[PDB]
PDB file of C-alpha atoms and ligand atoms in Angstrom:
ATOM      1  CA  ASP A   5     109.311 106.777  77.996  1.00 61.13           C
ATOM      2  CA  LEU A   6     108.250 107.622  81.527  1.00 63.79           C
ATOM      3  CA  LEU A   7     104.886 106.430  82.801  1.00 68.06           C
ATOM      4  CA  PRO A   8     102.485 108.493  84.850  1.00 68.14           C
ATOM      5  CA  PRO A   9     102.366 106.907  88.309  1.00 69.04           C
ATOM      6  CA  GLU A  10      98.767 105.928  87.598  1.00 66.98           C
ATOM      7  CA  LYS A  11     100.172 103.424  85.069  1.00 65.26           C
ATOM      8  CA  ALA A  12     103.453 102.415  86.712  1.00 63.89           C
ATOM      9  CA  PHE A  13     101.734 101.163  89.891  1.00 59.36           C
ATOM     10  CA  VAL A  14      98.224  99.751  89.577  1.00 57.82           C
ATOM     11  CA  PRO A  15      96.532  98.370  92.716  1.00 58.53           C
ATOM     12  CA  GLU A  16      93.590  95.982  92.689  1.00 59.03           C
ATOM     13  CA  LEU A  17      91.620  95.351  95.890  1.00 58.40           C
ATOM     14  CA  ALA A  18      90.073  91.950  96.688  1.00 58.74           C
ATOM     15  CA  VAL A  19      87.697  92.388  99.641  1.00 59.96           C
ATOM     16  CA  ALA A  20      86.754  89.046 101.276  1.00 59.53           C
ATOM     17  CA  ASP A  21      85.470  87.950 104.687  1.00 59.10           C
ATOM     18  CA  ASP A  22      88.958  87.509 106.148  1.00 57.93           C
ATOM     19  CA  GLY A  23      90.273  90.875 104.963  1.00 56.99           C
ATOM     20  CA  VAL A  24      91.509  93.008 102.103  1.00 55.65           C
ATOM     21  CA  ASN A  25      94.088  91.671  99.649  1.00 54.51           C
ATOM     22  CA  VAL A  26      95.922  94.264  97.518  1.00 54.12           C
ATOM     23  CA  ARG A  27      97.747  93.324  94.333  1.00 53.46           C
ATOM     24  CA  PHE A  28      99.954  95.907  92.684  1.00 52.49           C
ATOM     25  CA  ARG A  29     100.745  95.427  89.046  1.00 56.86           C
ATOM     26  CA  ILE A  30     104.178  97.051  88.465  1.00 59.87           C
ATOM     27  CA  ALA A  31     105.292  98.071  84.971  1.00 58.27           C
ATOM     28  CA  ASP A  32     108.597  96.832  83.551  1.00 61.53           C
ATOM     29  CA  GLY A  33     111.377  99.250  84.508  1.00 58.62           C
ATOM     30  CA  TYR A  34     109.744 100.303  87.817  1.00 59.01           C
ATOM     31  CA  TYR A  35     109.812  98.992  91.394  1.00 60.69           C
ATOM     32  CA  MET A  36     108.146  99.580  94.761  1.00 59.52           C
ATOM     33  CA  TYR A  37     109.285 100.000  98.352  1.00 58.80           C
ATOM     34  CA  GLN A  38     107.846  97.334 100.616  1.00 54.64           C
ATOM     35  CA  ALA A  39     108.366  99.632 103.621  1.00 55.53           C
ATOM     36  CA  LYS A  40     106.251 102.470 102.134  1.00 54.43           C
ATOM     37  CA  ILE A  41     103.072 100.386 101.602  1.00 55.58           C
ATOM     38  CA  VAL A  42     100.598 101.351 104.346  1.00 52.37           C
ATOM     39  CA  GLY A  43      96.849 100.938 104.881  1.00 50.86           C
ATOM     40  CA  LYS A  44      94.523 103.150 106.935  1.00 53.94           C
ATOM     41  CA  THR A  45      90.726 102.993 107.328  1.00 53.33           C
ATOM     42  CA  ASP A  46      87.861 105.344 108.130  1.00 57.06           C
ATOM     43  CA  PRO A  47      86.440 104.254 110.602  1.00 57.52           C
ATOM     44  CA  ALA A  48      89.945 103.681 111.943  1.00 56.22           C
ATOM     45  CA  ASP A  49      91.623 100.402 112.857  1.00 56.97           C
ATOM     46  CA  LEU A  50      89.338  97.950 111.085  1.00 58.84           C
ATOM     47  CA  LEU A  51      92.497  96.354 109.673  1.00 60.00           C
ATOM     48  CA  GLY A  52      95.448  94.680 111.331  1.00 64.19           C
ATOM     49  CA  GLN A  53      99.066  94.778 110.249  1.00 62.76           C
ATOM     50  CA  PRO A  54      99.649  93.739 106.614  1.00 63.09           C
ATOM     51  CA  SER A  55     101.197  90.480 105.466  1.00 62.23           C
ATOM     52  CA  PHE A  56     103.646  90.971 102.576  1.00 63.43           C
ATOM     53  CA  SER A  57     104.496  88.708  99.679  1.00 62.35           C
ATOM     54  CA  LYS A  58     108.165  87.882  99.111  1.00 64.14           C
ATOM     55  CA  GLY A  59     110.250  90.677  97.599  1.00 63.08           C
ATOM     56  CA  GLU A  60     113.916  91.388  96.809  1.00 65.98           C
ATOM     57  CA  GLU A  61     116.683  93.304  98.507  1.00 66.84           C
ATOM     58  CA  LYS A  62     118.208  96.284  96.789  1.00 67.21           C
ATOM     59  CA  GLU A  63     120.855  98.853  97.511  1.00 69.13           C
ATOM     60  CA  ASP A  64     118.966 102.001  96.606  1.00 66.49           C
ATOM     61  CA  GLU A  65     120.279 105.513  95.944  1.00 66.57           C
ATOM     62  CA  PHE A  66     117.372 107.137  97.840  1.00 65.64           C
ATOM     63  CA  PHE A  67     116.643 105.041 100.943  1.00 64.17           C
ATOM     64  CA  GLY A  68     119.659 102.730 101.089  1.00 61.76           C
ATOM     65  CA  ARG A  69     119.115  99.005 101.571  1.00 62.02           C
ATOM     66  CA  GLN A  70     115.485  98.035 101.071  1.00 60.83           C
ATOM     67  CA  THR A  71     113.122  95.229 100.292  1.00 61.44           C
ATOM     68  CA  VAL A  72     111.563  96.171  96.918  1.00 62.60           C
ATOM     69  CA  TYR A  73     109.117  94.749  94.399  1.00 61.11           C
ATOM     70  CA  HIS A  74     109.527  94.175  90.680  1.00 57.57           C
ATOM     71  CA  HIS A  75     106.533  93.043  88.550  1.00 56.15           C
ATOM     72  CA  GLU A  76     104.006  92.730  91.369  1.00 57.19           C
ATOM     73  CA  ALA A  77     103.421  93.373  95.046  1.00 57.09           C
ATOM     74  CA  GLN A  78     100.906  91.434  97.154  1.00 58.52           C
ATOM     75  CA  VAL A  79      99.669  92.644 100.541  1.00 61.80           C
ATOM     76  CA  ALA A  80      96.941  91.052 102.677  1.00 61.84           C
ATOM     77  CA  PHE A  81      95.323  93.079 105.451  1.00 62.44           C
ATOM     78  CA  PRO A  82      93.498  90.950 108.039  1.00 62.87           C
ATOM     79  CA  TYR A  83      90.320  92.166 109.659  1.00 64.64           C
ATOM     80  CA  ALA A  84      90.773  93.275 113.244  1.00 64.84           C
ATOM     81  CA  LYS A  85      87.098  94.268 113.670  1.00 65.68           C
ATOM     82  CA  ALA A  86      83.817  92.739 112.662  1.00 65.03           C
ATOM     83  CA  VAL A  87      82.831  94.841 109.663  1.00 66.03           C
ATOM     84  CA  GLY A  88      79.252  94.974 108.478  1.00 68.42           C
ATOM     85  CA  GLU A  89      79.167  98.599 107.395  1.00 67.50           C
ATOM     86  CA  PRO A  90      80.743 100.435 104.464  1.00 63.95           C
ATOM     87  CA  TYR A  91      84.076 102.094 105.147  1.00 64.30           C
ATOM     88  CA  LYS A  92      86.919 103.890 103.364  1.00 67.86           C
ATOM     89  CA  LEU A  93      90.378 102.387 102.804  1.00 68.40           C
ATOM     90  CA  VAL A  94      93.312 104.765 102.190  1.00 67.04           C
ATOM     91  CA  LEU A  95      96.282 102.961 100.639  1.00 67.73           C
ATOM     92  CA  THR A  96      99.704 104.636 100.649  1.00 66.88           C
ATOM     93  CA  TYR A  97     102.603 103.446  98.500  1.00 69.27           C
ATOM     94  CA  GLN A  98     105.720 104.706  96.733  1.00 68.69           C
ATOM     95  CA  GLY A  99     107.552 103.416  93.656  1.00 68.26           C
ATOM     96  CA  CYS A 100     110.484 104.399  91.455  1.00 69.02           C
ATOM     97  CA  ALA A 101     111.871 104.014  87.952  1.00 69.44           C
ATOM     98  CA  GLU A 102     114.992 101.890  87.359  1.00 67.79           C
ATOM     99  CA  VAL A 103     116.432 104.768  85.298  1.00 66.60           C
ATOM    100  CA  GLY A 104     117.113 106.437  88.637  1.00 65.21           C
ATOM    101  CA  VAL A 105     114.218 108.679  89.689  1.00 66.50           C
ATOM    102  CA  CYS A 106     111.396 108.219  92.181  1.00 67.79           C
ATOM    103  CA  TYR A 107     107.754 109.223  92.318  1.00 69.02           C
ATOM    104  CA  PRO A 108     106.368 110.869  95.468  1.00 69.18           C
ATOM    105  CA  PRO A 109     104.299 108.768  97.882  1.00 70.47           C
ATOM    106  CA  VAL A 110     100.813 108.297  96.493  1.00 72.35           C
ATOM    107  CA  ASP A 111      97.571 108.014  98.493  1.00 75.00           C
ATOM    108  CA  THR A 112      94.631 106.181  96.898  1.00 76.79           C
ATOM    109  CA  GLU A 113      91.197 105.936  98.526  1.00 77.36           C
ATOM    110  CA  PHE A 114      88.716 103.067  98.100  1.00 76.84           C
ATOM    111  CA  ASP A 115      85.075 103.266  99.129  1.00 78.92           C
ATOM    112  CA  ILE A 116      84.231  99.734 100.270  1.00 79.40           C
ATOM    113  CA  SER A 117      80.731  98.471 101.019  1.00 80.23           C
ATOM    114  CA  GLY A 118      80.972  94.715 100.623  1.00 78.37           C
ATOM    115  CA  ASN A 119      83.011  91.936  99.123  1.00 73.73           C
ATOM    116  CA  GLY A 120      84.471  91.872  95.625  1.00 73.10           C
ATOM    117  CA  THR A 121      87.201  93.573  93.653  1.00 73.82           C
ATOM    118  CA  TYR A 122      87.736  97.342  93.713  1.00 73.00           C
ATOM    119  CA  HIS A 123      89.634  99.629  91.406  1.00 73.34           C
ATOM    120  CA  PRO A 124      90.919 103.186  91.822  1.00 74.56           C
ATOM    121  CA  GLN A 125      88.372 105.805  90.836  1.00 74.44           C
ATOM    122  CA  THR A 126      90.548 108.576  89.445  1.00 73.86           C
TER     123      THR A 126
HETATM  124 ZN1  LIG B   1     115.233  97.023  90.463  1.00 74.20          ZN
HETATM  125 ZN1  LIG B   2      86.661  94.837  88.419  1.00 75.71          ZN
HETATM  126 ZN1  LIG B   3      93.090 108.827  86.010  1.00 78.00          ZN
END
């Protein structure tokens, strides 16, 4: 009874014309820090600042008061550049278990070449 992070926090990428939408599926008994969800691209700066779905507020033993996510987290990155070429998206996030321990920040890389849904490769 303690999931590998690969199973506690599962992101799915929806690449469309307006930008990249990320949905995290979050296993029962785990939660995610809104403030630790970050997106970077190579080439850099194709994406603007993320829009976040509504979360909850929690007094946390690690980072104090925080907006967190149970069950799911939704994050939409708008396009800041015209993108016609493939690029890499590096997603950073961090979640915890309700039992009272936290996973380290995790970086997950997506190789994007056009529209559709993308899954993690490892
Ligand atoms: Zn909680
Ligand atoms: Zn798929
Ligand atoms: Zn794996």
